[PDB]
Structure formats: C-alpha cells, structure tokens
Amino acid sequence: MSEESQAFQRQLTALIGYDVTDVSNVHDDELEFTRRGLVTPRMAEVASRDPKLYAMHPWVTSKPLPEYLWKKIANNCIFIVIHRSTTSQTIKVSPDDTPGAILQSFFTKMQDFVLRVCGRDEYLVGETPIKNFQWVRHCLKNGEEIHVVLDTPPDPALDEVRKECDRKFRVKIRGIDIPVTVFVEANIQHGQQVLCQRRTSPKPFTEEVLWNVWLEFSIKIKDLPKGALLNLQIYCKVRLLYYVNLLLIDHRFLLRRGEYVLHMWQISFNADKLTSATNPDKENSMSISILLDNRAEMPNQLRKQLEAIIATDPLNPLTAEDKELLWHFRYESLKHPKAYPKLFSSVKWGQQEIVAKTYQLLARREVWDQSALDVGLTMQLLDCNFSDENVRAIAVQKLESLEDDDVLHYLLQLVQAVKFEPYHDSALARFLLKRGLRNKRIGHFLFWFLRSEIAQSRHYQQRFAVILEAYLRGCGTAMLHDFTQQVQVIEMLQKVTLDIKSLSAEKYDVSSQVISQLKQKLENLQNSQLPESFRVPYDPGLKAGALAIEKCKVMASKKKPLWLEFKCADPTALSNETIGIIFKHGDDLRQDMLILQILRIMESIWETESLDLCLLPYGCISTGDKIGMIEIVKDATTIAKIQQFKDEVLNHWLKEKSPTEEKFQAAVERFVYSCAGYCVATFVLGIGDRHNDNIMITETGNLFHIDFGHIRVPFVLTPDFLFVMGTSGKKTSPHFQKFQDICVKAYLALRHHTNLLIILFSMMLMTGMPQLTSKEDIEYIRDALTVGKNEEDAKKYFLDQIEVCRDKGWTVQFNWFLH
C-alpha cells in the first residue's frame, strides 16, 4: 500500500537492524535484484507448508536411540504424566508408540486435543515414535518425568502471511585518494586462486596519487570465469593496507563495463577479504578509481597413486603433478565422491575450454547423486576454495536430504558459509531460506544468526540483510510479533549494560551506588517498557516474563556484565526456577557461538557411537559488536571461587552439595564423564590451556568450560580433579583407569570424522577469528588429531598428554596468577 506498505517495511527495517532499501553504498542493482529474485523461493515454501505441523513445529529426529539411553527405559515402557486444570494421571507407554496412539489410549481409558509440554512451548505431536522426540529424549538423558499439559491445538490463522572478444582484459588505474612508498596490485582472483597479477609503478605516497595506467593482463575476455573477482589491493614496507573487490562478471551474466570509484577496507587469509561490498564510510575511507572498457583402462601403479591422493586429508596440498593426474583421469575420479574437492580444485578455471569440460563432468554425476550424504564432504565444496556456481550447487543439492534435526546442527556454519558465495542470490542462500520458513525452530535461530552479523559486520551486512528480510516476509505474523519483542528486550537491557559499565573501570570491584543505580534502572523497564513476556533467544521454547530485581546483581569481574533472572511467563511450569541471562560487553561472543556449536556437533558424533561425555554447550547469542547474552547454568560455581592451591577442596565441596553417597557417586560420575569430554573436545580445538577461573562445575558434578575469548599444558587436568578421581601424583586408581578409558574411547570417535572436524575448524577460523589466519594456524588440528597413525600410536600419543598435565600439576595455574 502507501502508508500501510511503508509501515510494514518500517517494521521489517527495525527487526533487521539495517535498511535494505538504502542505496547510498552500491554501484549496481544486485542487492535489489536479489530481493525480487528470492520471492519465488519464498512463496513456494510458504505455499507448501502444513499449517498444523508448522505452528506446533515438532522437534524430531529419525536417528536411533543410544545404547545408554535404552538402559533408562528397561521395560519397553515409558512414564508420561498428563495434566488438565490441576488433574494428573500416569500412563505407561511403548517407546514405539505415537502421540496419537497414547492420546487416544488416554481418552478410551478415561477430540481435537494435543499434548503440549509442561513449562515450555514444545509440542509432542506427529507420526513419530515418542522415542524419537528431542524433549522426550532429553528427559531420559537427565532422568526426568515427561510432564505434559493437555489442551487445544494452536490456531494456524496466527502463522498467516501478509499479501506480498579476444583481447587481453585490461583495467586502467586512475589513482588512489584518501582524506587523511605506494603501489596498486590488481589481481584476477577465482575462489582464493590467483589467475593474473599486475602492479603499477611505485610512486611517492601522498593523499592523492594518479597513474592513468592501462593494466593489461594475460587473460582473454572469454577465459574469464563467472564469479571472478577483480581484487584491487594497495601496498606500502612492504605490507597490505587496503583491499576492495569487484565482480568482473555481474549477476546477470554481463561483463562489467564503466567508471568505478571504490572505497576500500583497511587492515590491522580470512573471509572478509573476498567481499563484493565497499566501505560505506565515505567520509574517512581510502578511495580508488578505475576504468572498464572491455573409454579406456588405467595402469595398476597409476590407479594406486590416484587412490593415495584421494585418501589424504582436506588440508593436504595438491602438487602440480597431482592436479594434472586428477584432471587427466576425471572420469575415474568421478567414481569417487570423496575425490570431488581435489578434482575441482585441480581445474584450470582460467580457460573457457577446460571449464566447458568440467560442466560436461557434472552432467552426471550419476554416482554423486547416489552417494550417502557426507556432510564433512559437502562443506568442503562450500568454502573459500570454490567459487563456481555449479560446483557449489551440487553441495547444496546434497544438503537437501537431511532432516531438520541436522540443519540445526550446522545452521551456524552454513550461514557463515554464505560469506564465501560470490553472488548474493545463491543455492545456499535460497536453501537457508527454504528450510527456515518450513521449520519454526530453524527460522528462529536463522533470524539471530543473520542479525548477529548484520549488526557488527560492515563487510556483509548488506547481503545477510537481504536474506533476513527474505525470511521475515514469510515466517508468519505470529513470528514477527515474537521477534519484535525479543529485539526490544535486548535493545533495552543492552543500554543498561553499557550505561552501568561506564560508571566503573578495572579496580572498580563493586560499590553500592551501582547496586542502587542498576536496581533502579530495571524499574524503568519493569514498569514501562519491558513486555509482559518475551521469548528467550537461545531457547525458543522458553518464554520469560517478569524480572526478578532482587536476584539481579552486577558481576564483579574485570568488566561489567549483568546477572539477570526472570520468572517463566508460563503458568503451567512444572516447578519454579528463574531463567538467567548474562548480558556482557567487552568480549566477542561470535567466537563463543562458534565453539559452542562445534561442541554440540561433537556430541552428535559421540552419540552415533553410543558415548555420553555429558558436555554442557550452554546457549550464547551475539547481539551486537562486543556484546551479547549468555545462558546461566544453574547451580554452577567456578573452581577459582571454590579455592577462594589445595587438592581436597573439590571433594569436600562436592560431598557438601551431595546429600547421600548415592547422589555423590553420581557427582563423581558426571564429573569423570564431563571431564573427559571437555579434555578431549578442548585438546582438538587447541583451546586446552585455560585458567582455573574459566572452568566451572555444577553441584551435581558436571564440569564445563566458559568464555572462549581469544583462547605449556595440553589441557586443564589439575591434581584437584585427580583427588576426586582417587589419585595422587603418579598413583593409579579405578576412576582414573576409567578416565583414560572414556577419553581414548571418545578421542578416537572424533578421528573417525577427521575430515568433518577439519573443515569446521578451518571455516571457523576464516569467518570467526580475525584477522589474518595463517595456513599454519589450521595445520594444528591435523597434528592434534594425528592424521594417519593407526588407532595404536595415536591413542598412545594422546595418553602421553594426560601424563604431562599430571607431571605439571599446578605449575601453569600458579604462573597464571603472576600478573
């Protein structure tokens, strides 16, 4: 409409945190072009969504049930408790039973009714054995009673959506211009690969430097591959100071032609360096001007050598020899899906004819389309090393086959993977969009993962923003309402975190002018702004309402984060236990998100091989620059705050918090499990050496790391843990022979997915850890995983580690103390 369309786009702009209608920072219509283009995908998914299963969004997995979780249910029977008003009864169910089965069973024993979960916004519905729901599978993990309130199915009317040449390519470098030696290096890149490179003559380094030079390259105009970047860089002794890119071929297949004034990025190897976006800070940024006016058999020994190349890790560099060997035998390599990354990385993309052949390869592709989806393999074809629409599209095609349970597992990295797409509209984008709209849960975390970057990343906010809007216009009017509240809450509570922080610096400790000011500001919100109830952004199912002013402190840390607690705004909550958020400024929680996400993935791995290291990957979302919220683990304490250089303290503290030897032997169990998991998970990611301050433990033995900021001893295994494990400097015990038992059993489980991990660790570095990431930085996880060696001298390798941490004891922790 007029004002009604303006109000709708005004709302969308407020939810996004960025204006997608703004054009004061483009030089084409690709961002606009994408908006119009993504409509069809949007409308198609919206059209074909089961309104009932959508509103209720059953969180389900089609995976088996772990050995350990089969034990809890030792009778092919499961106890589910149903409530109505204040009514209550207990039903015995078969693991292979159905929501409908059990429901009808209750009615006949004692329509239009559905089983909702107690305290949450979770639904136990669908044609799935209830031994396949996540909530049910969760209770069993923590040994709990599946409480379920029975009421009416929610109205889908709420999820409603509103009505809508053969010349050598040459480029002239006019000159650079900055408000307040030097030369220019104009590369033609294609997926990290450099095809041609031309520099300008060195000149004095002043605010305005002109060359008026035509830079001819070695490449024809037809040899230019779609997705090729013109990478303009600026060097001074000598160092890279400014970079900017420009897609040689545009979003509509046209060869770019004309005059360009480009504002660059300055520095201070990663994902930010291949963006088609220009610095929007015209007032301060450097500028740059340019002109565009343009079968058979195979020998035994050779097969052997080809099969050795295809076996190596994804970080193993390809020799020229290797590459030519791959490409001469492409049809024998196509037999093997695990040879695809290396195959297309051995393609000369700077040759029209070759690329032509390559597309002839992807014609079929019979074997690829028939391979059991290898996610670790699919990720490799979506990284920086690949920029061919067709290559990346066979990876996205392979993603189309996983359940929603797995999309959630990788949503974060797939979203960050968008940073590698050359164009805005892409198989990947449209996929995150298609899958988000179809599942309420995915759409939720999608929102916050995009908003995370749209708000603190100038390099990509424009692209992500066009994608977010795409999702918002088809998520539902019920989802929109929700999001608007969540945005207001963090918008308010962030004010309070920054305002409070400026009232005190290091050495501030805490004074009661703050304990008065803080508990005075939570009023303004409570009685005016703060909504009656807002959905928790790290746990969608949990609604939180009123505040708990009394229990809201201001952490006495090196900086000032908040300790907020809320009352569950849901009446039917099984018990009482506040929801605690920690609003923090000063750290980058986008690095935390990444580690926590990989932690969840290591769980799923350990799950396939029936292990349970009971990790504690708490929720953690990044809201803005250097600011975000964390989920407060209940009944947890720091080892540091536990000793405030003694060993027995841990045991005393556990026993103190554990009434009976039974509820204490579990506290040493949960401890040994959680301890092994965190010792392995950490050693692999190279974030092993921590301080006693950055490790916590619940009153029930569960150990868990925190604050993975910018993170001598392979990992924290101090004698204080050992005392709990009944061991003292060099002596051996059962719980310690059980410790080495769990560890190696888990460490090897990960080595079975070396390829997957490596690609996530790699990508994580490029999209999450700034700035320059060496090729040597990644080389770590290889050795940390011991690529190659059998499960023999590999387990031995790891068991050497466990020993170092014992023969070091407190050494490092004490050295940490020195400041």
Ligand SMILES: COc1ccc2c(c1)c(/C=C1\Oc3cc(O)cc(O)c3C1=O)c1n2CCNC1
């Ligand atoms: C994570 O759940 C917690 C439970 C209790 C907690 C904390 C967290 C926490 C502090 C923190 O947690 C964090 C988790 C992160 O990913 C990143 C961070 O920068 C932090 C952090 O600064 C403190 N306490 C007890 C009272 N002093 C401090």
